[PDB]
């Protein structure tokens, strides 16, 4: 009779486990019943602190009320600019909350671009280090000598040659957040608004995001136009070094400069990048064709021969169109034997570029 008792015991165990599952279900149901009695709370912004117990809070899409804190809250946490949860009836601040927008085009984070990706900028890389690493790594040496850090470092040169690549490389070397300016939330000189744009420039960067800045329209402001230049000078002239608005500009042309910026502190460093060297272009080919599946022998010097007067972005779409014509002719591989003809056809009025075609 032992086997029958064991069978009924096993069925009993199954039924007990089902009962435990029912226990979990009933506790969840009671928890949701308890949740039903809860009532939502309006989301508001604290404009100003009136007294130790009075606050001015404006609803996200409503009017502003003078209210009071609930009780067991840190009034230190309730500062002008914090998101809080007003009770919907007494309007009392029950709790605070962590905080698109214009900054939706402000960030332009560097990414994981490192030194290895950038090829043929050894002297340029050393210049960036000697200019920037001291303000980052050793700001105290400037106090040791007793001078404000240099702010304006101009890495002027042709666009598409890796200026932002160099900046991202050094940023990843120091793992510092590179906040390249995308105008919105950082526009200053833009004459549409005078001081609100100044406020966005300052507060969005440096204060919130630690340091490491850049600028867009790389040659626009470097080159009503006179008044625009005076306002630019007022924007950039000289700011507190506690907060870094380091203006690492990389204007595309030398003639797009004026003596009004050549003063140190305004634009001190003049890092110069010229047309990419043939060996530098070679290294750029190597790194950019790394990712492409290149089976067989590739003699990159032959494709170097006809790569004169190019930039890095040219070389990148050379690799991309290598892949494109590999798809078009069904080759998982890509060899130099057609690298030759591709480089034969990547030089015309609009630099020919995509017409290079034959490349696998």
Partner 1 sequence: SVWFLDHDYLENMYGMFKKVNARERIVGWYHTGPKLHKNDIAINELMKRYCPNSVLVIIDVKPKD
Ligand X SMILES: Nc1ncnc2c1ncn2[C@@H]1O[C@H](COP(=O)(O)OP(=O)(O)O)[C@@H](O)[C@H]1O
Q: Which residues are annotated as a binding site?
A: 157-164
Q: How far apart are CA 358 and CA 325, in angstroms?
A: 6
User: Residue 69 carries which DSSP code?
Assistant: B
Stretch that binds ligand X, among 55-63, 69-77, 160-168, 232-240 (CB under 6 A): 160-168
Query: Is the Cβ of residue 37 or residue 349 nearer to partner 1 in the bound state?
Result: 37
Residue 175 belongs to what H/E stretch?
A: none
**Pairwise CA distance, residues 327 & 331, whole Å:** 6
Q: Which residue is nearest to ligand X (CB)?
A: 312
287 lines the binding site for ligand X (CB under 6 A): yes
If one asks whether residue 271 binds ligand X (CB under 6 A), the answer comes out as no
* Residue from the set 110, 150, 154, 164 that interacts with ligand X by CB under 6 A: 164
Supply 49's token pair: 């602190």
Nearer to partner 1, 34 or 227 (CB): 34
| Contact call for residue 323 and ligand X (CB under 6 A) | no
Question: How far, in Å, CA of 176 to CA of 188, rounded?
Answer: 23
Q: For residue 69, list its beta bridge partners.
A: 93
**Segment near partner 1 (CB under 8 A); pick from 33-41, 62-70, 202-210, 331-339:** 33-41
Judged by CB under 8 A, the residue of 2, 3, 4, 37 near partner 1 is 37
Number of residues that bind ligand X (CB under 6 A): 20
For helices 278-289 and 312-328, give the axis angle rounded to 10 degrees.
40
CB under 5 to 8 A by kind: which of partner 1, ligand X, none does 167 bind?
none
Q: Is 76 in the site for partner 1 (CB under 8 A)?
A: no
Q: How far is CA 260 from the centre of its chain?
A: 30
Query: What is the nearest approach in angstroms of ligand X to the Cβ of residue 315?
Result: 6
Name which of residues 14 to 73 contact ligand X (CB under 6 A).
none
* Shortest Cβ 39–partner 1 spacing (Å): 11
Angle at 183 between CA 181 and CA 188, to 5 degrees: 100
Find the binding residues for ligand X in span 236-255 (CB under 6 A): 250
Binding track over 83-122 against ligand X, x by CB under 6 A: ----------------------------------xxxxx-
Q: How many residues does the chain have?
A: 360
- Residue 39's binding partner, choosing from ligand X, partner 1, none, with beta-carbon cut-off 5 to 8 A by kind? none
- Point out which span in 30-38, 105-113, 207-215, 325-333 binds partner 1 (CB under 8 A): 30-38
User: Whole-angstrom Cα distance, residue 217 to residue 226?
Assistant: 18
**Residue 33 binds which entry of ligand X, partner 1, none, CB below 5-8 Å type-dependent:** partner 1
Q: Which stretch binds ligand X (CB under 6 A): 68-76, 144-152, 158-166, 322-330?
A: 158-166
CA distance 319 to 290: 9
Residue closer to ligand X (CB basis): 120 or 150: 120
Size of the site for partner 1 (CB under 8 A): 3
Chain contacts with partner 1 (rule: CB under 8 A)? 33-34, 37
Chain contacts with ligand X (rule: CB under 6 A)? 117-121, 159-165, 218, 250, 284, 287-288, 312-313, 316
């Amino acid at each position: 009779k032992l086997l029958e008792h064991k069978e009924i015991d096993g069925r009993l165990k199954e039924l007990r486990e089902q009962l435990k599952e029912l226990t979990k279900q009933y506790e969840k149901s009671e928890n949701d019943l308890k949740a039903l009695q809860s009532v939502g709370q309006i989301v508001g912004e604290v404009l100003k602190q009136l007294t130790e117990e009075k606050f001015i809070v404006k609803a996200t899409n409503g009017p502003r009320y003078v209210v009071g804190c609930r009780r067991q809250l840190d009034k230190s946490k309730l500062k002008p600019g914090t998101r809080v949860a007003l009770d919907m009836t007494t309007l009392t601040i029950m709790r605070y909350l962590p905080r698109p927008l214009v900054y939706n085009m402000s960030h332009e984070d560097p990414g994981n671009v490192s030194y290895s990706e950038i090829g043929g900028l050894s002297e340029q890389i050393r210049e960036l280090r000697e200019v920037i690493e001291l303000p980052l790594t050793n700001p105290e040496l400037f106090q040791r000598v007793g001078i404000i850090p240099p702010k304006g470092c101009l890495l002027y040169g042709p666009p598409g040659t890796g200026k932002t690549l160099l900046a991202r490389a050094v940023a990843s070397q120091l793992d510092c957040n590179f906040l390249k300016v995308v105008s919105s939330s950082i526009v200053d000189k833009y004459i549409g608004e005078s001081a609100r744009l100044i406020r966005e420039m300052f507060n969005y960067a440096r204060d919130h995001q630690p340091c490491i800045i850049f600028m867009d329209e790389i040659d626009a402001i470097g080159g009503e136009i006179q008044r625009t230049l005076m306002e630019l000078l007022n924007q950039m002239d000289g700011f507190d070094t506690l907060h870094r608005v380091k203006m690492i500009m990389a204007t595309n042309r030398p003639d797009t400069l004026d003596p009004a910026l050549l003063r140190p502190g305004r634009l001190d460093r003049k890092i110069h990048i010229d047309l990419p060297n043939e060996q530098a272009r070679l290294d750029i080919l190597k790194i950019h064709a790394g990712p492409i599946t290149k089976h067989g022998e590739i003699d990159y010097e032959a494709i170097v021969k006809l790569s004169d007067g190019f930039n890095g972005a040219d070389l990148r779409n050379v690799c991309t169109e290598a892949g494109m014509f590999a798809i078009r002719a069904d080759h998982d591989f890509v060899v130099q034997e057609d690298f030759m003809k591709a480089v034969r056809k990547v030089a015309d009025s609009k630099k020919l570029e995509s017409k290079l075609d034959y490349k696998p």
